[PDB]
Structure 1
């Protein structure tokens, strides 16, 4: 369950660097921790013993990833360059941006691209009018139902009964049966509109990003407010634009 339990699950593998896993887990311990963190606080978050956590922080400090006053610790901007290593080496992310920017300019709305990681979607590219590297739940987002629809029937049920299908609004689908029917309908449309299931006033439309082999690599969407655009404009104007841009992107990376 905990980050430590994940690390110690490989303790029988001789090629698994426990201290590198712990160090990466220490970086993750700062997620959404607006203030700075002590050793004890990080050791409670991750269940990593304080001695290891201190040595991880000490190591990150000497490498320029972190700083301290002796009591609290905070990450340094150099950590951002780690995410850049993924961006500047991933052609999908690089080639999506001009499409994301043009979509945003035509419609005056935010446009995004996410992949699936576990039970969440991970925003890998944005074009704003909440952040690259940020996560949202898959079951109640447009881009997530796209990527849940790409799953085979086996992996989808394993997700549904294992995910926290918490109800966020009056309209959020929160049970596996309702969601599976929803996914079956996304599967048949090849697009997805979610209306105010993540938070009120928010309504978005997503389409899949394919490779030349047919696999869904990712999803593309547009984020709108319910008061400005209607479901009619979403499906009759936004959808053809998103599909045109998605096929252009597919053809550009993979012929």
Structure 2
């Protein structure tokens, strides 16, 4: 190797704006201007400028005076959640055990808005469109197995509101993407207590998911196992993966509550 050489009065608007400015960077690989951030967030430019100035002084962002980027310190905000949340902490040995036994990826997600949000994953690579899925990433609820678990937990009025507004695009030719077929699908998921999705999010990808409850019988999250097409038989998901996942969900609930 070569050497190394040389009103609500308690709502704090500026905190809200600063977190929205951080969110404006989602999926933007080129540094951003104030104009772009203001456009995306509908926050006035002068406030965006102050937010960025504050983030820079605190080590969360950087600039050349014209454009702006985030710094790695932003990752420590998510680490504050991961290291203070029993659900995320306790689920990791379970996902690791599921994955070691099945030699497939295992995940846990919650609902955030119209998407599922990954909170913990086993140690396997799962690439969507050759990009690793990761803790903190989001996927649409209507076309994922964990999304359908979490939509099934809604009451019918909330579910219909979601289906009349959501972007139901046909991700593959298999995807259920009209409100009547999604509603009937979600009703069966309720009856079953589990959901299989077969290549409705992307070609080649199959997953099976179950709910995780708290002591009150409320759905806190979903657990799943996710696989590629030629890695499984057609009925292995239900016969092989499902009892493992049901048992893990039951064990995690008992451990926490």
| TM interval, short-chain normalised | over 0.9
TM-score by length of 2: 0.92
Deviations 1:119-151 (A, max 9, x none): 111101111321111110001000000011111
Task: Give the Cα–Cα distance (whole angstroms) in 2 for the partners of residues 11 and 213 of structure 1.
Answer: 61
Shift of 1:82: 0.8
TM-score by length of 1: 0.93
Query: After the TM superposition, which of the residue ranges 78-87 and 140-149 deviates more from structure 2?
Result: 78-87
Structure 1: unaligned runs, 5 residues or longer: 1-9
Shift of 1:24: 0.8
Contact (CA 8 Å) 1:113, 1:124: kept in 2 or not? yes
Task: Give the Cα–Cα distance (whole angstroms) in 2 for the partners of residues 245 and 11 of structure 1.
Answer: 53
Would you identify which runs of 4 or more consecutive aligned residues in structure 1 move more than 6 Å? none
Shift of 1:44: 1.8
Shift of 1:154: 1.5
SS at match of 2:161: helix
Q: Paired residue for 1:143? A: 146
Task: Give the Cα–Cα distance (whole angstroms) in 2 for the partners of residues 242 and 73 of structure 1.
Answer: 43
SS at match of 1:213: coil
RMSD: 4.8
SS at match of 1:231: coil
SS at match of 2:43: coil
Task: Give the Cα–Cα distance (whole angstroms) in 2 for the partners of residues 119 and 25 of structure 1.
Answer: 17
Shift of 1:11: 52
Shift of 1:240: 0.7
The 3 A distance-change label for structure 1 pair 162 and 11 is: farther
Alignment equivalent of 1:119, drawn from 100, 111, 114: 114
Task: Give the Cα–Cα distance (whole angstroms) in 1 for the partners of residues 141 and 91 of structure 2.
Answer: 21
Task: Give the Cα–Cα distance (whole angstroms) in 1 for the partners of residues 27 and 61 of structure 2.
Answer: 16
Contact (CA 8 Å) 1:66, 1:73: kept in 2 or not? yes
Task: Give the Cα–Cα distance (whole angstroms) in 2 for the partners of residues 39 and 161 of structure 1.
Answer: 34
Task: Give the Cα–Cα distance (whole angstroms) in 1 for the partners of residues 184 and 234 of structure 2.
Answer: 20
Shift of 1:231: 3.0
Task: Give the Cα–Cα distance (whole angstroms) in 2 for the partners of residues 197 and 88 of structure 1.
Answer: 33
How many residues of Structure 1 are paired with residues of Structure 2 in the alignment? Answer: 245
Task: Give the Cα–Cα distance (whole angstroms) in 1 for the partners of residues 56 and 225 of structure 2.
Answer: 40
SS at match of 2:230: coil
Task: Give the Cα–Cα distance (whole angstroms) in 1 for the partners of residues 255 and 234 of structure 2.
Answer: 30
Shift of 1:43: 1.7
Task: Give the Cα–Cα distance (whole angstroms) in 2 for the partners of residues 128 and 192 of structure 1.
Answer: 23
Shift of 1:230: 2.2
Shift of 1:202: 0.6
Deviations 1:198-252 (A, max 9, x none): 1111110000001121111100001101111023111101101111111111111
Shift of 1:107: 1.1
Alignment equivalent of 2:178, drawn from 156, 160, 175: 175
Shift of 1:52: 1.0
Shift of 1:109: 0.9
Contact (CA 8 Å) 1:169, 1:198: kept in 2 or not? yes
The 3 A distance-change label for structure 1 pair 11 and 20 is: farther
Contact (CA 8 Å) 1:145, 1:192: kept in 2 or not? yes
Deviations 1:43-62 (A, max 9, x none): 22212222111111001011
Contact (CA 8 Å) 1:109, 1:128: kept in 2 or not? no
